[PDB]
Amino acid sequence: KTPPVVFHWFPFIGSTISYGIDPYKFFFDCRAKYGDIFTFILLGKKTTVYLGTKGNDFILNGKLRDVCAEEVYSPLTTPVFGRHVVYDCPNAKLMEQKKFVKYGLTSDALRSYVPLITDEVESFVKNSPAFQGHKGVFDVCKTIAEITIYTASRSLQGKEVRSKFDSTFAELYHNLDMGFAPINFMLPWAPLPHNRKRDAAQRKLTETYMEIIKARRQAGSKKDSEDMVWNLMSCVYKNGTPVPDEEIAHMMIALLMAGQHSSSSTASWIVLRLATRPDIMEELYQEQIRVLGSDLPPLTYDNLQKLDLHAKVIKETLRLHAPIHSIIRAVKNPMAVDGTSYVIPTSHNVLSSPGVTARSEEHFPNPLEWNPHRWDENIAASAEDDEKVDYGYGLVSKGTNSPYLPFGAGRHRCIGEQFAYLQLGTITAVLVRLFRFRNLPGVDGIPDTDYSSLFSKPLGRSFVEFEKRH
Ligand code: HEM
Numbered sequence: 001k002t003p004p005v006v007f008h009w010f011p012f013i014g015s016t017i018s019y020g021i022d023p024y025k026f027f028f029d030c031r032a033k034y035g036d037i038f039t040f041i042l043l044g045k046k047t048t049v050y051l052g053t054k055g056n057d058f059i060l061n062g063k064l065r066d067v068c069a070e071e072v073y074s075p076l077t078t079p080v081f082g083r084h085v086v087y088d089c090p091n092a093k094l095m096e097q098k099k100f101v102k103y104g105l106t107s108d109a110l111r112s113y114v115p116l117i118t119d120e121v122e123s124f125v126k127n128s129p130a131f132q133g134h135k136g137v138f139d140v141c142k143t144i145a146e147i148t149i150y151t152a153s154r155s156l157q158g159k160e161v162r163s164k165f166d167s168t169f170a171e172l173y174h175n176l177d178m179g180f181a182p183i184n185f186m187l188p189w190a191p192l193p194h195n196r197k198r199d200a201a202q203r204k205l206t207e208t209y210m211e212i213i214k215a216r217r218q219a220g221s222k223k224d225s226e227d228m229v230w231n232l233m234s235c236v237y238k239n240g241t242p243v244p245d246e247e248i249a250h251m252m253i254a255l256l257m258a259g260q261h262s263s264s265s266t267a268s269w270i271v272l273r274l275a276t277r278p279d280i281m282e283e284l285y286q287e288q289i290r291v292l293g294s295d296l297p298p299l300t301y302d303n304l305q306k307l308d309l310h311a312k313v314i315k316e317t318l319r320l321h322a323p324i325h326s327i328i329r330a331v332k333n334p335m336a337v338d339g340t341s342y343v344i345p346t347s348h349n350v351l352s353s354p355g356v357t358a359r360s361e362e363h364f365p366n367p368l369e370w371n372p373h374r375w376d377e378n379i380a381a382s383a384e385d386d387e388k389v390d391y392g393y394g395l396v397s398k399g400t401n402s403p404y405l406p407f408g409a410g411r412h413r414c415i416g417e418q419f420a421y422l423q424l425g426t427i428t429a430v431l432v433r434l435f436r437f438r439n440l441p442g443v444d445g446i447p448d449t450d451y452s453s454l455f456s457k458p459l460g461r462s463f464v465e466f467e468k469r470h
């Protein structure tokens with residue numbers, strides 16, 4: 001039926017289970033049965049998978065009013081972030097909003113962020129119950145969720161938001177995060193208790209961001225450089241309107257969720273991998289000394305650059321683990337194929353999977369092997385000998401043909417990528433200073449992945465040993 005249809009027992013439910021349990025195996029099988037294009041049903045909608053590098057190009061460089069993102073996302077996201085931002089607007093508005101955020105993340109801000117993030121990771125160690133003592137075990141995901149949330153908030157969100165995380169400002173985010181409950185895939189409007197709580201969180205949070213904002217202006221200052229003093233002025237659209245406190249409030253919320261979903265997961269995988277690879281961790285420690293100096297002086301915007309393998313660790317973890325597995329778009333007008341029989345209908349979605357190409361023998365030898373050293377030919381923030389475009393938030397890669405595209409591509413491309421690197425880099429390096437990790441029992445491996453919520457993370461409550469260095 002048009003592009004072939006995956007074989008499913010059930011209506012509506014269709015293939016929904018096989019995707020949910022694992023999207024990658026589900027995808028590798030469908031490649032083996034129908035090649036690079038199949039169509040499956042996910043919760044009562046026909047979703048077309050165009051795999052492969054050309055497949056990534058199709059959707060992410062799709063033209064604006066053939067594929068539409070904000071129509072797939074808005075009913076889940078808008079209750080969560082707040083109205084009038086991100087998906088709550090026509091693309092044109094999302095481009096401007098990105099530009100504000102990108103403007104906020106200039107190298108001068110990143111620099112300013114580095115000491116703050118080290119400060120937050122050093123204090124957490126000194127002060128949290130998690131690493132008390134010379135040797136012990138810790139719950140990686142919970143510990144790491146705390147560290148990432150503290151560091152991001154301190155730098156990006158600012159002092160108030162940060163200190164608010166000592167007051168129960170985290171009941172809220174926890175409660176807000178319920179809006180990403182899988183059920184909410186179709187039921188986001190329905191007022192089950194979790195949905196009601198999220199609306200409670202959303203109200204309170206938004207108020208709180210606004211009190212912060214107004215109170216600053218109530219004194220007419222600047223301090224130094226988070227996204228928000230940033231947005232406070234770093235906010236005028238083409239039309240010439242300053243961004244309202246409410247849109248500032250909701251972007252801050254959206255950014256918070258984005259980092260948290262993304263960086264927490266990755267950093268946890270970073271921790272677990274090292275835990276299985278004491279050779280690597282000790283290779284990193286030794287790299288610090290060599291490039292870094294035996295003194296081991298503090299980290300800076302400048303030094304982290306020199307940490308070549310540290311960066312390769314993050315890169316290679318991202319290769320196997322990038323949380324996002326599936327980028328979905330609403331097909332609006334029938335799309336003609338590259339030299340093939342097929343027409344892609346309206347009332348189809350399309351789904352690209354960056355990770356598949358990145359786990360492929362065709363692009364990567366021995367793909368399932370987690371080996372940083374495979375980048376002993378290459379290092380970048382994701383970089384390309386390929387095209388670039390300004391969709392309204394500055395020149396960025398169209399040149400998005402790489403098999404490795406973990407930050408996406410095209411007009412929706414991630415703009416957190418440097419900050420992610422800034423942070424994950426800063427976090428892992430510190431942890432490399434202070435610790436050796438190793439696997440818990442004498443029974444070892446790497447835990448499975450919970451793909452089930454739309455973003456991937458480690459499935460387990462996974463503890464790992466730790467031993468300090470002094
Ligand atoms: C490993 C960490 C991260 C990964 C893997 C990641 C991945 C991605 C991906 C794949 C997209 C495009 C998905 C799509 O097409 O809808 C994206 C978009 C985006 N990411 Fe990230 N991201 C990361 C970190 C961050 C951080 C820290 C922020 C913010 C601080 C951020 C903010 C965004 C934003 C604003 C978009 C815009 C999407 C759009 O315009 O439609 N990301 N990210």
Ligand SMILES: O=C(N[C@@H](Cn1ccnc1)c1ccc(Cl)cc1Cl)c1ccc(-c2nnc(-c3ccccc3)o2)cc1
Nearest residue numbers: 072073076077086185254255257258261262414454455
């Ligand atoms: O997690 C989601 N979005 C994140 C992704 N992210 C993280 C870092 N970079 C990108 C996100 C992106 C941008 C911003 Cl500003 C904030 C965040 Cl938190 C996400 C987004 C949308 C959905 C979603 N909305 N509708 C669906 C849907 C509906 C029906 C069927 C299948 C999916 O999924 C799920 C997760």
